[PDB]
């Protein structure tokens, strides 16, 4: 049970990190557009 | 860009919380191994 | 069995996220070189 | 940058897929606890 | 035991990935400040 | 930026190592299922 709960915790962290990554990608594309 | 900064701040806080919780759960699962 | 499978899933996601991260790093490096 | 763009797309899709199947497996593991 | 250890492994990887993300955010902010 | 590049390098190496260790442990856990 503790292990299954922990897996949920990890999965949620991975999901939140994915949102962050997608935000960094958007940012890079914005800059790239203005810089080139 | 203003929204971008808002979301960055929001997800960063969320991750810090999740990492925190996971840390607590790791300790307790580690304890339980004994 | 289900737990081990799930761990494989999570590790794979972490690996894929790492590749994305390396791509963002590359992008940032290209941009700063054009600038600073 | 054209290739960067292709790889960004490719890894983003893969990640979305892995997250999807992890979610399914999570549900399954949760049911099995009962 | 191996399962719990693997969870530690994964969590540590997620933590390290987070440091990396934070660094990419810093970089993007620096660029945006200049390039705009 | 000079420090940024150093930190990127440092964290990338660590992640690589953690991933490797996890890969090893995954394969151990997999054989143990039998």
Q: How far is CA C19 from the centre of its chain?
A: 3
Helices marked H in F1-34: 2-32
**Measured distance CA(B15)–CA(B34) in Å, rounded:** 29
CA distances from B34 to E1, E4, F16 (A): 10, 12, 30
Kindly provide the residue ranges of all beta strands, DSSP E only, lying in C1-36, ordered along the sequence: none
Terminal-residue alpha carbon distance, chain A: 53
User: 């995954």: which residue's tokens?
Assistant: F26
Question: Residue E6 and residue F11: Cβ atoms within 8 Å?
Answer: no
**Chains F and D make contact, 3+ CB pairs within 8 Å:** no
CA atoms within 13 A on the CB side of B27: 6
Q: Is B1 helix (H, G, I), strand (E, B) or coil?
A: coil
Q: How far is the alpha carbon of B2 from chain A, nearest alpha carbon, in Å?
A: 12
Q: How far is CA A7 from the centre of its chain?
A: 17
Domain ranges of chain A: 1-36
**Measured distance CA(F9)–CA(E19) in Å, rounded:** 12
**What's this structure's resolution in Å?**
1.7
Mutate to test the interface with C, among A3, A5, A6, A7 (most CBs of C within 10 A): A7
Q: What's the angle, vertex CA C7, arms to CA F27 and CA F26, rounded to 5?
A: 10
Mutate to test the interface with A, among D2, D7, D8, D24 (most CBs of A within 10 A): D8
Method: X-ray
């Amino acid at each position: 049970s503790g292990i299954v709960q922990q897996q949920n915790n990890l999965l949620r962290a991975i999901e939140a990190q994915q949102h962050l990554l997608q935000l960094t990608v958007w940012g890079i594309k914005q800059l790239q557009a203005r810089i080139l | 860009w203003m929204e971008w900064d808002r979301e960055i701040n929001n997800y960063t806080s969320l991750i810090h919380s999740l990492i925190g919780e996971s840390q607590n759960q790791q300790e307790k699962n580690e304890q339980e191994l004994l």
